[PDB]
Design a protein around this nucleic acid. Structure first.
Ligand SMILES: [Zn+2]
Ligand SMILES: [Zn+2]
Lengths: 49, 256, 49, 213, 97, 102, 111, 267
RNA sequence: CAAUAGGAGCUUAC
């Protein structure tokens, strides 16, 4: 790990054992048609998106 | 079009200069057609520390004044107060809620049978003045049967299920009033529905086709007087549905 | 340095949470225990940033 | 116990009344000004300690300066009544006594309330003037407050000078209600103009004038 | 960030989790990139800002119109006084200086 | 996951006009008769046999906002309903929502 | 907790036997009057706690969204427990938690 | 959010115990604030009891209606307001002089209890209990629901004439009752201030109202570091206080003037 | 030397 470049995936330390029931197919699918054109929308402040 | 869901009970807090504090609101609709029919609130009069009577009073559709709850429970066919409480109280051991339930029982102690309570409802049915008891009862019984929770059922002989749903609504009201459960979220997206082309065109077509059938009636009143056979191809003005659908889809104004 | 400061603030917030959960947090005048907890956490995170 | 507190509040109210009289222009003996709580308790209270409010009622005469300045300034009567509620009976007695000894102004300090039926006799007792105050209101002298600048009622000649200097009519001035606490404290009648000098952060000093409704 | 779901901000968190990440702390920078959760929380905050900008301007414009109508007739006159259209004095000297 | 968090008009329509997420879908509606039949098979007891003096632990079942019965053991009912939906026997766009505290 | 009539099935209200000075309970519909056990007639509370442990079911272990803790069951030494805070939602409520064993099903606390 | 700023007398203003005593004097407590749970017992014989805790107490208190009120008083709540049983029982007798007879358990008693007797009465007791719980005052000024012990960094000259900071205890409150708090001994009666300038007008006059109005407007503007020149806010507060009373910036204020009809209609 | 009105909807910049 310890990658100073890739973003830190959250620690999630409070919970001892996770029991997942579902997974996102891909997180970028939360956006709609118009927001899907934006490249790297996770590097912008939301009003600009 | 985005709209709140139908046939779900939601309980809301109220404001300081309001005698009403807690309101359970349900809108009703049928599985066939998915159209609204009637709405029926159950409000909690009495503010915190003011308004000494913390009673709960319903609001039936097609009646001007709000009826107490025990009155309508008796009118629906469960007279003994033990059974009324049991329809409201699932767990006798709980005591705070039962302590908040007495003023309703006291404000509706007068009634002891179904006929008198159902008349008491009838005396408020917003109809013409001076109907005699035997048909005031029929009018009120019709209101209690249809236009009261049509989603439950609209046929007679199944009043117990409506009483149980009323007990559930009152219990959720009290849970919100006794702080044992949180108030319903207005902005929650799971309590909303989206009306696409299907239901929108269904509503508009229902309106315009009832227009057409009224036209058919208004033609069969006259033409039948002549005592002639008619081929029904001059009895339907086809331009009504066409003009209505075209007007709504071309302007956007959804209605006549 | 930045990630160390953020981790230290996360530990501080976790300690505030522990103190609030075992009922040992010191309230403030005109302010509830839950509002005191929230105010202290907001102070910590603003100072972290 | 609670009697000491009642006596102290009554003494503070009495000192406020005397400060009112001296501010309004009446002569007050310097020794009765500095009336202290214990000496007041000696001269007023009883063996049981409860106070006789009928001895506090005094008579004040105008200082000669407030006569050379306010020529319309007569003689004052101040009565602390003993009945908490005051009705038309007591107001009738007060007006009879005021007209009986041609007192120009009569201040009637009451305890609890003055009923409207009694209150209607207050203005119909010309040419004397009757004003009433409640003791609870008089506990603090509000003209000593930092936010309350010093009000000084003008004389007729000075009011005319004020109106002519600004080429003004009476209705074009800022106004003060006769029921204003500082107009009530000063015994302002309709048409009289106070002058209000006050702090000014842009100029240092600023003189304001208000006319009485 | 409020518990919009039942006892949580997002359905990717557990119940009653008060940690900074659950309730709207964004640990990354814009250069590093936001996670989907941080992206959604930042979207809620930006949406709140846009609503505020859109909605308060009407109250502000109403307030400024009422102030202008209340003060529209007030002028400093040649004698130094500050009077309205009725000639009534508002200040005997403008600004007191 | 349901409406785009970024696409919304500026101005007076802000937040009222929404835009669907790419994988969003709107239900068409479905007959409730097979649902009721499946519920009746697996053990739901009706409200004409209901007595809250005894049923202090039973879980109450709502169908389309209509309270239709109670069950002694929601675990196997939700498991079987989810398996039926995931096998195709039930329309895939049918919600199967267990609430545990209530 | 007010009772109900053994004959008329309505609810009984208090009354006084002035010839015996004992608190009975009077039916406002029928004439039946039974002896009571408890002389309490009224109650009122402002500091209440109903809803502390009530937010628990048998199958609360089946909730997959509840966070799981390592607290020791004092009862059953279980190293796996789901936990949650007071389910009462008032403003002045505590923030102490509750702990449910998935092994022993006893609810406990950390005190 | 109504609020007073109660400046204390200097002797109090430096000591903290004295400031807390003044706080206790200014704060409002009702029987609600110190009451846990009220009961009702049927006690047919006044000289005896059907209960088992207070029998010894009433046998030590002796050597009407059989309806009894048994209200319980929590310990720490009683403890925090410097209140004991004597003042509470006296206060109850103050408004129930002879239409009520009050018994009260002692303060060291393992159960803090109060017993009352009426002189069918199972509902007048409920009404009286409600009226007591909702209208009996114990100490303080009505209208002051909370009080805080605040610190003010006043700048005062030294004995050399040079300005030096000085750390004094003052008071902030919730709610408003200006007239009664100004009178309370230990308060600087010449400096008490309210953030509701309608109260100022009713109590202190119109010039003090103008001063308070300017203070509020300056606070609202300068909150965020904005600076508006003095004369603009002075003009705004002078227009609002020119008639002798507060003229609101609304149609109900602007259109009740004597100006021409066309101006008023144009607004 | 003469280019309708009323509505609704979508947008622009604050
Ligand atoms: Zn009976
Ligand atoms: Zn165990």
């Amino acid at each position: 790990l310890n990658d100073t470049a890739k973003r830190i995936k959250p620690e999630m330390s409070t919970s001892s054992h996770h029991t997942f029931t579902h997974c996102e197919i891909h997180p970028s699918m939360i956006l709609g048609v118009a927001a899907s054109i934006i490249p790297f929308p996770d590097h912008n402040q939301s009003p600009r998106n | 079009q985005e709209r709140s869901a139908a046939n779900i009970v939601q309980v809301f807090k109220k404001a300081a200069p309001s005698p009403i504090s807690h309101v359970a609101e349900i809108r009703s609709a049928l599985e066939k057609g998915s159209r609204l029919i009637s709405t029926m609130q159950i409000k909690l009069y009495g503010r915190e520390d003011k308004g000494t009577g913390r009673t709960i009073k319903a609001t039936l559709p097609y009646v001007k004044q709000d009826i107490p709850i025990v009155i309508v429970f008796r009118a629906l066919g469960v007279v003994p107060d033990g059974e009324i409480l049991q329809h409201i109280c699932y767990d006798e051991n709980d005591w705070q809620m039962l302590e908040m339930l007495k003023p309703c029982i006291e404000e509706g102690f007068v009634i002891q049978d179904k006929e008198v309570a159902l008349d008491f409802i009838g005396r408020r049915g917003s109809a013409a003045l001076g109907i005699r008891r035997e048909k005031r009862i029929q009018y009120a019984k019709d209101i209690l049967q249809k236009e009261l929770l049509p989603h439950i059922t609209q046929e007679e002989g199944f009043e117990t299920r409506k009483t149980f749903f009323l007990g559930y609504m009152v219990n959720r009201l009290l849970l919100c009033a006794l702080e044992r459960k949180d108030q319903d979220d207005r902005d929650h997206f799971g309590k909303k529905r989206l009306d696409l082309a299907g239901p929108l065109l269904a509503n508009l077509f229902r309106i315009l086709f009832r227009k057409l059938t009224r036209e058919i009636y208004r033609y069969m009143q006259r033409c039948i007087e002549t005592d002639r056979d008619f081929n029904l191809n001059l009895a339907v003005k086809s331009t009504t549905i066409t003009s209505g659908l075209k007007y709504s889809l071309a302007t956007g104004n959804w209605g006549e | 340095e930045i990630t160390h400061a953020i981790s230290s603030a996360k530990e501080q917030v976790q300690e505030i949470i522990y103190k609030a959960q075992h009922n040992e947090l010191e309230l403030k005048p005109g302010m509830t225990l839950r509002e005191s907890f929230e105010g202290e956490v907001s102070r910590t995170l603003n100072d972290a940033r | 116990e609670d009697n000491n507190r009642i006596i102290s509040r009554l003494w503070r109210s009495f000192r406020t009344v005397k400060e009112m009289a001296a501010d309004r222009g009446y002569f007050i003996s310097q020794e009765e000004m500095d009336q202290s709580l214990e000496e007041f308790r000696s001269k007023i209270c009883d063996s049981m300690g409860n106070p006789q409010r009928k001895l506090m009622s005094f008579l004040a005469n105008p200082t000669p300066e407030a006569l050379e300045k306010y020529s319309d300034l007569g003689t004052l009567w101040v009565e602390f009544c003993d009945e908490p509620s005051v009705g038309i009976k007591t107001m009738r007695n007060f007006c009879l006594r005021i007209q009986e000894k041609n007192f120009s102004t009569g201040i009637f300090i009451y305890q609890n309330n003055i009923t409207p039926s009694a209150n209607k006799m207050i203005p119909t007792v010309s040419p004397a003037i009757i004003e009433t105050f409640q003791e609870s209101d008089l506990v603090v002298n509000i003209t000593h407050h930092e936010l309350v600048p010093k009000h000084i009622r003008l004389s007729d000649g000075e009011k005319s000078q004020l109106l002519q200097r600004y080429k003004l009519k009476e209705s074009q001035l800022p106004r003060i209600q006769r029921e204003d606490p500082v107009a009530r404290y000063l015994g302002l009648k309709r048409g009289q103009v106070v002058k209000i000098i006050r702090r000014s952060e842009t100029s240092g000093r600023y003189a304001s004038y208000r006319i009485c409704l | 960030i409020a518990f919009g779901f039942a006892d949580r901000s997002l359905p990717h968190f557990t119940k009653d989790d008060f940690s900074p990440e659950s309730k709207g702390f964004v640990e990354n920078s814009y250069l590093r990139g936001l996670t989907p959760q941080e992206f959604f929380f930042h979207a809620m905050a930006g949406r709140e800002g846009l609503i505020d900008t859109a909605v308060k301007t009407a109250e502000t414009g109403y307030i400024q119109r009422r102030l202008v109508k209340a003060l529209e007739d007030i002028m400093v006159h040649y004698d130094g006084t500050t009077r309205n259209s009725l000639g009534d004095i508002i200040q005997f000297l403008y600004g007191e200086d | 996951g349901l409406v785009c968090p970024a696409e919304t008009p500026e101005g007076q329509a802000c937040g009222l006009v929404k835009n669907l997420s790419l994988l969003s879908g709107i239900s068409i509606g479905s007959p409730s008769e097979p649902i009721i039949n499946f519920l009746e098979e697996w053990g739901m007891e009706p409200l004409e046999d209901y007595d809250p003096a005894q049923h202090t632990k039973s879980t109450r079942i709502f169908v389309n906002g209509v309270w239709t019965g109670i069950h002694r053991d929601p675990s196997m009912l939700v498991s079987t309903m989810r398996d039926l939906r995931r096998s195709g026997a039930i329309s895939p766009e049918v919600s199967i929502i267990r609430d545990i505290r209530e | 907790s007010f009772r109900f009539c053994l004959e008329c099935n309505n609810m009984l209200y208090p009354k006084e036997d002035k010839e015996n000075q004992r608190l009975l309970y009077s039916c406002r519909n029928c004439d039946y009057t039974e002896l009571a056990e408890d002389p309490k007639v009224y109650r009122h509370e402002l500091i209440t706690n109903i809803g502390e442990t009530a937010g628990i079911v048998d199958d609360i272990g089946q909730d997959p969204t509840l966070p799981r803790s390592d607290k020791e069951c004092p009862e059953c030494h279980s190293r796996d427990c789901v936990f949650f805070q007071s389910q009462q939602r008032r403003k002045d409520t505590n923030m102490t938690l509750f702990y449910v064993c998935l092994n022993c099903k006893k609810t406990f606390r950390d005190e | 959010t109504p609020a007073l700023t109660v400046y204390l007398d200097r002797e109090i203003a430096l000591d903290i115990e004295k400031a807390k005593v003044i706080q206790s004097s200014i704060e409002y407590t009702t029987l609600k604030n110190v009451t846990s749970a009220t009961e009702i017992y049927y006690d047919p014989d006044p000289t005896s009891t059907v209960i088992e805790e207070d029998f010894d107490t009433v046998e030590a208190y002796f050597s009407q209606s059989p309806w009894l009120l048994r209200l319980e008083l929590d310990r720490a709540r009683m403890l925090d307001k410097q209140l004991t049983m004597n003042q509470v029982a006296d206060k109850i007798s103050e408004v129930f002089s002879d239409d009520l007879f009050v018994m009260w358990s002692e303060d060291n008693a393992d159960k803090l209890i109060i017993r009352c007797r009426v002189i069918e009465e199972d509902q007048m007791l409920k009404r009286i209990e409600a009226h007591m719980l909702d209208l009996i005052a114990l100490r303080g000024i009505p209208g002051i629901s909370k009080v805080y012990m605040v610190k003010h960094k006043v700048s005062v000259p030294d004995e050399s004439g040079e300005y030096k900071n000085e750390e004094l205890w003052a008071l902030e409150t919730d709610g408003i009752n200006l007239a009664e708090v100004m009178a309370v001994p230990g308060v600087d009666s010449s400096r008490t201030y309210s953030n509701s300038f309608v109260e100022i007008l009713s109590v202190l006059g119109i010039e003090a109202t103008r001063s308070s109005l300017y203070k509020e407007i300056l606070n609202v503007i300068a909150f965020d570091g904005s600076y508006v020149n003095y004369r603009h806010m002075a003009l705004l507060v002078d227009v609002m206080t020119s008639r002798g009373y507060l003229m609101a910036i609304t149609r109900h204020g602007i259109n009740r003037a004597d100006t021409g009809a066309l101006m008023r209609c144009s607004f």
